Amino acid sequence: IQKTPQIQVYSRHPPENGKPNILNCYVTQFHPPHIEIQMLKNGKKIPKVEMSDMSFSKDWSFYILAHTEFTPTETDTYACRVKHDSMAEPKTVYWDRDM
Amino acid sequence: MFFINAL
Amino acid sequence: GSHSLRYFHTAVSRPGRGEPQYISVGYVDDVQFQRCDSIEEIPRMEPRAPWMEKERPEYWKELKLKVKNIAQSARANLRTLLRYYNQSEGGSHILQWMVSCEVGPDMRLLGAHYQAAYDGSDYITLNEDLSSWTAVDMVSQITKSRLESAGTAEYFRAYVEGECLELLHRFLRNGKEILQRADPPKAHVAHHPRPKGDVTLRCWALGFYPADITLTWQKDEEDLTQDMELVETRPSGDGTFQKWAAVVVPSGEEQRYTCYVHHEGLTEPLALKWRS
Ligand SMILES: *[C@@H]1O[C@H](CO)[C@@H](O)[C@H](O)[C@H]1NC(C)=O
Ligand code: NA
């Protein structure tokens, strides 16, 4: 089979401008397991992104968590960019402080 | 940590 | 109340450069305790939960040999499955299986599971009785026939009643503080005006363990199942989980709407409205 990733970008704790936090990119519902995940701040790749081990659910689809430290502010933009073989091109999802 | 040969 | 030891195994026949030919992750309930893999035939193991620091060196030496033997066996099985499914030699194919055992509150065994998938689809399943198998097609029927003639489920039951039970008992004891617990959700309703004059109501639940939860919106006397946007439950990264559910509603009617939260850590369903 082939299954397309679902992507969620969100903070560990409710965000407050100026206070350190953790930014999560949770990618689920994909098959096969090869996947490429990057995170970006203000248009620059973030080098220090931690990756959990990959696992899978009872329907056999895989899931993984990437995360990095961040400090939200009123102007800084954050994104997670994902590429999987089910996709012709990468997909970028921006962090939204309300979701 | 267990595996059964399918064939 | 019950507890489970669960392993999630993956083997890949032509992994990318640097990628594992074999990887497995082990959990107790919703907490990961280790990673095992084999990359270019070198086995590696890493702990992921703090109680694993209490394991003796003999645990890891035995585990290393299991990893080498399983990876070799899964590789051989991928080679046979390619032939039986009349597939070409160039592509990469995927073998997955799940192994678990389950105990009740009093640590009594309640059941176990062995289930396998090829290329993301069910292949064979061990039944409730831990003696017969369920196949999906004629290839897996051959597997079933051979397993039942050989009596091979006997040796899985011996694993369940031996090493699976031993580890679940020891991990529940050494990890009691982390594993024998329920953290209830901390829940609130957020309010977001939209450029067209209506409003988004977003019901949040944070900081709960275990992961299983239900969030529902309800209108006075009207069902909102098709109306709400519900995100898949997600890890916060600190050992707790979060989720939200949202509905779009007309300005001025926000008090017609109610969010209900159901979780193991609550005494009863929690009911929330937008406070203002
Ligand atoms: C593979 O081909 C052989 C010979 O044509 C056939 O007997 C067998 O059923 C095929 N396998 C599957 C899974 O269809
Ligand atoms: Na046998």
> Which regions of C83-181 does DSSP assign to beta strands (E)?
94-103, 109-118, 121-126, 133-135
Nearest to A98 among C10, C19, C192 (CB): C192
All structural domains of chain A with their residue ranges? 1-99
All structural domains of chain C with their residue ranges? 1-181, 182-276
Q: What kind of experiment solved this structure?
A: X-ray
Question: Cis peptide leading into C210, omega within 30 of 0?
Answer: yes
Resolution in A: 1.7
> Which residue in this structure is represented by tokens 């595996």?
B3
DSSP 3-state of A74: coil
Contact yes or no for A72/A11 (Cβ under 8 A): yes
> Which regions of chain A does DSSP assign to beta strands (E)?
6-11, 21-30, 36-41, 44-45, 50-51, 55-56, 62-70, 78-83, 91-94
Rg of chain A (C-alpha set):
14
C133 C-alpha to center of ligand 2: Å?
13
- Residues in Cβ contact with C57 at an 8 Å cutoff, skipping those fewer than 6 apart: none
A49-86: b or e for each residue (b if 16 or more CB lie within 10 Å)?
A: beebbbbbeeebbbbbbbbbebebeeeeebbbbbbbee
What is the CB < 6 Å shell around ligand 1?
A: C 85-86, 139
Mind telling me how many Å the CA of C25 is from chain A's nearest CA? 7
Neighbour count for residue C141 (Cβ, 10 Å): 13
> Which residue in this structure is represented by tokens 């009093």?
C106
> Could you tell me which of C129, C117, C46, C20 has the C-alpha nearest to residue C78?
C117
Contact yes or no for C137/C86 (Cβ under 8 A): no
Contact yes or no for C210/C265 (Cβ under 8 A): no
Q: Whose CA is nearest to atom 12 of ligand 1?
A: C85
Q: Is C84 on the interface with B (CB under 8 A)?
A: yes
Contact yes or no for C271/C258 (Cβ under 8 A): yes
> What are chain B's partners, defined as 3 or more CB pairs within 8 angstroms?
C
Q: How many residues does chain A have?
A: 99
